Every structure is written in structure tokens, then in C-alpha cells.
């Protein structure tokens, strides 16, 4: 029934309905200045490598964003530790590297507009985009 429908259909298009359940959870969250991966993050994380290993023909960008004071060039290269910590872990869930990729926006595409530290924590995250 519903989100637990489609075990009738081929494999491939069980993996869309998949994605789409990925969807709904594929942001990691950070503390300022951390790029470290929270245990709270480790079982979606897994869902996500899971599918991944499943698929081998999807791939998989890790855009890592920041709000942190300093420069936008610091931002940017938070932004690429945090997108890489999350490459690094599901890499070591058995993802083969060449399924995911990193970008890093920095401040340059936030989720949560203003200039105050709950808008601040809603933009220091790492997105999965398939």
C-alpha cells in the first residue's frame, strides 16, 4: 500500500520509486565550523549507500553548502570538507567513488533566508541530489 507498493515491478523501476523515497531525507546537518557526520545521520546515510551499491548506473552529487562568518572562499571550502565527509562515509559503505560526486555552493544557495544563527543552522548542511 502506497510507499510500500510496486514489489511487482522490475528492478529498475522499483529504484524510481526508491529515489523519490531518498528524496524525503538527503540533507546532513552541521554545527558551525563542523564537518563531522552525527550518528542521528549514519542510518539515512546507509539508505542512501544501499541504494546506491543497488544501482550502479545512478549517480549521486553531494552539494556541501555553508553559513559561517569568515569569507565566502572560507565558506566554499567548508563547504567542500562537509560534501566530502559524506562522499568519504559512503564511500566506506561500499559506494564506489566514481557514483558520487562533491560540489561546493557555500553561501550561495541558501535554504533559509536572513541574518541570524536559526537561519544560519537550517544552511549548514550537505544535500545527496540524484
Given at each position: 500500500?502506497?510507499?510500500?507498493?510496486?514489489?511487482?515491478?522490475?528492478?529498475?523501476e522499483?529504484?524510481?520509486?526508491?529515489?523519490?523515497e531518498?528524496?524525503?531525507?538527503?540533507?546532513?546537518?552541521?554545527?558551525?565550523?563542523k564537518?563531522?557526520?552525527g550518528?542521528?545521520?549514519?542510518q539515512?546515510?546507509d539508505?542512501?549507500?544501499?541504494?546506491?551499491?543497488?544501482?550502479?548506473?545512478?549517480?549521486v552529487?553531494?552539494?556541501?553548502?555553508?553559513?559561517?562568518?569568515?569569507?565566502?572562499?572560507?565558506?566554499?571550502?567548508?563547504?567542500?570538507?562537509?560534501?566530502?565527509?559524506?562522499?568519504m562515509?559512503?564511500?566506506?559503505?561500499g559506494?564506489?567513488?566514481?557514483?558520487?560526486?562533491?560540489?561546493?555552493?557555500?553561501?550561495?544557495?541558501?535554504?533559509?533566508?536572513?541574518?541570524?544563527?536559526?537561519?544560519?543552522?537550517?544552511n549548514?548542511?550537505?544535500?545527496?541530489?540524484?
Amino acid at each position: 500500500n502506497a510507499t510500500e507498493n510496486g514489489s511487482n515491478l522490475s528492478s529498475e523501476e522499483q529504484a524510481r520509486l526508491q529515489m523519490q523515497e531518498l528524496q524525503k531525507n538527503n540533507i546532513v546537518y552541521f554545527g558551525f565550523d563542523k564537518y563531522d557526520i552525527g550518528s542521528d545521520f549514519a542510518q539515512m546515510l546507509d539508505a542512501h549507500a544501499a541504494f546506491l551499491r543497488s544501482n550502479p548506473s545512478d549517480k549521486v552529487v553531494v552539494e556541501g553548502h555553508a553559513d559561517e562568518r569568515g569569507t565566502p572562499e572560507y565558506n566554499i571550502a567548508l563547504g567542500e570538507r562537509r560534501a566530502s565527509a559524506v562522499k568519504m562515509y559512503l564511500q566506506g559503505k561500499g559506494v564506489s567513488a566514481d557514483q558520487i560526486s562533491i560540489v561546493s555552493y557555500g553561501k550561495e544557495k541558501p535554504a533559509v533566508l536572513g541574518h541570524d544563527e536559526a537561519a544560519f543552522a537550517k544552511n549548514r548542511r550537505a544535500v545527496l541530489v540524484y
